[PDB]
């Protein structure tokens, strides 16, 4: 009976490429690396300013694009779960060596599998120190989202200047996009991979050791 928000969300003349019966979301342009138009719930078309979680909207007038926030959140979910699925399997001995720290706190006779390493080290205190170290990094890197939301920064999403071996230093814009797609494609799978390991070990059937089935 008023004008529907459906028309503000969809393109209405183009279909989504991944889901061909749905109209294309308005923010998905194909310019982002892993973009195949997959947004069947239209979460990029949500008109909220999701940078309000970091700095509230009543602090000052600002607004981040919803697709910029989702890609910054997707890239952080990609890069965390790549290290996390690797670190679960490396400390479980999936790659041959049961890789542990030199301390006896982290030894296999104290922590037999990586399934028990969370609760055993919240109690000891190694996870409380990681929460400080990650929280210090997330405070210095998370404040750039306010600089983007105020329009003062031209920084791309998930685009710190962290290229110490400089793989993308002289590369063209086309092969930079291919490398960003390989980060996204391997990150999307490692997110689902970490969903596999953390759930199959948590069943009542068990198998806290590799291969977790």
């Amino acid at each position: 009976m008023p004008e529907r928000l459906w028309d503000s969300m969809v393109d209405k003349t183009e279909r989504s490429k991944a889901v061909p019966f749905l109209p294309r979301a308005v923010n998905l342009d194909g310019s982002l690396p892993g973009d195949v138009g997959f947004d069947p719930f239209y979460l990029s078309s949500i008109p909220k300013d999701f940078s309000g979680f970091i700095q509230p909207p009543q602090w000052e007038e600002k607004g981040i694009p919803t697709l910029y926030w989702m890609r910054e959140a997707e890239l952080k979910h990609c890069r965390v779960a790549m290290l996390a699925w690797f670190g679960w399997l490396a400390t479980d001995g999936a790659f041959g060596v049961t890789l542990r720290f030199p301390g006896e706190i982290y030894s296999v006779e104290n922590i037999p599998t990586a399934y028990e390493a969370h609760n055993a080290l919240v109690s000891q205190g190694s996870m409380g120190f990681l929460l400080l170290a990650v929280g210090f990094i997330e405070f210095c890197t998370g404040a750039v989202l306010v600089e983007v939301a105020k329009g003062a920064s031209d920084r791309e999403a998930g685009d710190f200047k962290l290229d110490p071996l400089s793989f993308l230093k002289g590369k063209s814009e086309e092969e930079i996009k291919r490398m960003k797609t390989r980060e996204i494609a391997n990150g999307r799978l490692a997110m689902l991979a970490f969903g596999g390991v953390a759930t199959q070990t948590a069943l009542e059937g068990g198998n806290h050791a590799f291969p977790y089935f």
């Binding site: 400089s166 793989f167 230093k169 590369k171």
Partner: protein, 173 residues
């Protein structure tokens, strides 16, 4: 590339997976310094495994409680566990200074600067007839390449018996 030192006669330049173009010229300059440091470490590691594995040890005492003889009775990878922790702190502390010094040169080797040269004693190998230095840099890397295979065979033979057919009934393994 082939104008670089490490390309030699049988396979030169050797890059079937084309890893040199996977980054920039600063990525290849990192790869060359990492191959050279892996070679220099494994050349001392292969020689350190064969000298200590032969029974050749220094005379006397390593610490006030640990002798050099008591370490030479063990296999070499097990002899590191019985080095005193004050001794490992002296080794790693000196390596820490050597890695901080060779990184803090005025030009980085990733930006075309020099590769890690000798810290102590700080011998200058600058004007050492670059035609000879070219041939000796090919022989440093080739002896580094072989000793990286050699020390990985030494860890594999000490843990998985029969993995190296020349070190099956070798008593040091």
């Amino acid at each position: 590339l082939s104008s670089l030192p490490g390309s030699t006669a049988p396979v030169g330049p050797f890059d079937p997976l084309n890893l040199a173009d996977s980054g920039s010229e600063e990525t290849l300059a990192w790869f060359r310094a990492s191959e050279l440091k892996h070679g220099r470490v494994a050349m001392l590691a292969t020689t350190g495994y064969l000298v200590q594995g032969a029974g050749i040890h220094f005379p006397g005492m390593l610490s006030s409680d640990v002798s050099f003889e008591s370490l030479s009775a063990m296999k070499p990878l097990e002899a590191w566990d019985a080095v005193p922790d004050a001794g490992k702190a002296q080794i790693l502390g000196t390596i820490f200074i050597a890695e901080m010094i060779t990184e803090s040169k005025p030009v980085h080797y990733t930006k075309g600067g020099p590769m890690p040269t000798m810290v102590f004693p700080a011998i200058d190998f600058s004007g050492v007839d670059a035609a000879t230095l070219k041939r000796k840099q090919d022989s440093e890397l080739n002896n580094g390449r072989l000793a990286m295979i050699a020390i990985m065979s030494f860890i594999s033979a000490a843990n998985i018996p029969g993995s190296v057919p020349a070190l099956t009934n070798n008593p040091a393994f």
